[PDB]
């Protein structure tokens, strides 16, 4: 998670495992009722401002292997080029929604913008995988 | 939640899931007995000074979709104009009780003021929805 | 709760729900054995230095509605005037033990003094209600 | 509890109820096996550097009313006059081991000295009450 | 765990036992399904930035002695020289993946670089042992 | 526990009871399988840098009275003198592995060194008692 520190600088801390497991245990599986976890994750993406690694823990903990895969491919399918249209260009897809750890630095506007987009695409992925 | 920090400045931390689920598990549903969750949320709105996002999280966890919709509707119906009378002017309803994430900056007096009003309206909404 | 922070600043944090429910679960009800919760709350009023809102949360959680109302009624009957003698003057009663949220600021000496007095009266009210 | 802060300034924080109840739940009653809670409290008196209020809370949670009264009685019997010999003079007994909240300020050397003595006497009291 | 604070200060805190045991309790053994604990540990290596001591504690808690010994053996088999080439010269293996506590200092680039390398080799070791 | 602050000053905090009881509850007794608790304590001695008092809580919580006494006996039997050779001279044994609370100031070289030695001897005691 990230939060704005008292000094005007973002501050990082890892998710407590109790939160992750509580979220899991108080909801149906994604397959049973996708709306439940999707709404929970949409909320957390905002309040907890997760990094890319944090998102991997969210997904890894709340979804099964098969569910996560569906979501990730759905998220990559939601990437748009600069012309606002879908794109399947590897470099564009990889840049927006990387499958391997990116070098995004949350102390930079560049890093922050990628994080914003990543979270937006993650949500889209879940919404579409649910449907 | 927001709390005043060491430098007389508001600091933010997300709700602990243990608190949210403890609140859920120790009270009847809103439909079952609205007074209990209403009183709890009234209290939490003050002690935890939640942001707009926190409020969506609080509500989404403690109320069903059906219940929350009812609550948000009553809240918007309780908005008053500068003449102390009910107002249905969309711009005024939306400015006081937005249904989508507003740009309220809690470090500013204006955002702080919007948050106090949002919380009062939410409470009025729960009270009215309860009746 | 309030505590003296590291910059000679009084610092606020909300009660943990785990503490509130643990206190309820490990004691008989106020009606069953008033002495137990009275002693617990007496202690907490000092160790946790609760604000007026904290006190409402505390009482609202540990006492039933009828119990709480009895306690507040008795607290208000235990107000004294500036001569140190009992008073029933509504203005002195409302100033020392408001039933609605006061404008008390814990960063001011006046607010702090009001809080010390409010907690003292709350204890008196619990003792008298118990008896 | 008290701990030395960064600048050698003691900082106060109240006991977590989870610690108090875990200690209770993982030991026999004082009456069943005095040495158990005695050793636990002895240790806490050092690691947590409790204030007078903390001590009341610790004893009030872990001992029954009757057990606690016996401990406080034995503690008071262990008070010594300035000559290092037993004293039963009420002014001396009350200054060293007050039954009512004293005005000790842990930010002063004298308040600190009073607390050290109080804890020492409390341990003696438990030891002797145990016998 | 290590986290970055203020304006760049690394800060150490030991793992919470609740986290370690939750991780253990919500996953199959390494021998039953290596990919699960592997993915979890890989994630933790990044989010919690564990020291060498932390890594021993993490492995010791989540893997049996046999499993842990296999992982460390494989990590050591995957050591490379500074030039990127594989090496099994004893001194270079020991420098990159020590079996005994090293004197790495996280306030120096040399220390931080050693820890980053250790975690990388640990991951490789788990993957290989898993295979 | 002790940890290093950014300014190089050690900072003390007491063990959470949740950690101590979790350690106890997730492991066999020392008499059952000495290796388990021994390894656990070995790890805690490093990550948590416990003081003498902390070590008493670890031992007193994780071991039975008989086991603890046996561990302390073995630790004291393992003491070495100024020559690095074994010694059983009372003053040297009591200085290295005191049974009563010592005056070790962790801000001094001498105090830190006594602590490191105490922890090493505690581990030796456990290993030897296990055998």
From Swiss-Prot, chains A, B, C, D, E, F:
Q: How is it modified after translation?
A: Sumoylated; required for virus replication.
What is its subcellular localisation?
A: Virion
**Quaternary organization:** Homohexamer. Further associates as homomultimer. The virus core is composed of a lattice formed from hexagonal rings, each containing six capsid monomers. Interacts with mouse UBE2I and mouse PIAS4.
User: What is the stated purpose of this protein?
Assistant: Forms the spherical core of the virion that encapsulates the genomic RNA-nucleocapsid complex.
What name does the UniProt record give this protein?
Capsid protein p30
Q: Which organism is it from?
A: AKV murine leukemia virus (AKR (endogenous) murine leukemia virus)
């Amino acid at each position: 998670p990230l939060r704005m520190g008292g000094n005007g600088q973002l501050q990082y801390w890892p998710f407590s495992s109790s939160d992750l497991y509580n979220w899991k245990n108080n909801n149906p599986s994604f397959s049973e009722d996708p709306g439940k976890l999707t709404a929970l994750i949409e909320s957390v993406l905002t309040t907890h401002q997760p990094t890319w690694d944090d998102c991997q823990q969210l997904l890894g903990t709340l979804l099964t292997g098969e569910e996560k895969q569906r979501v990730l491919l759905e998220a990559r399918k939601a990437v748009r080029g600069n012309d606002g249209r879908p794109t399947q260009l590897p470099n564009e897809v990889d840049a927006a929604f990387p499958l391997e750890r990116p070098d995004w630095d949350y102390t930079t506007q560049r890093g922050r913008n990628h994080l914003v987009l990543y979270r937006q695409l993650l949500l889209a992925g879940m919404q579409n995988a649910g449907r």
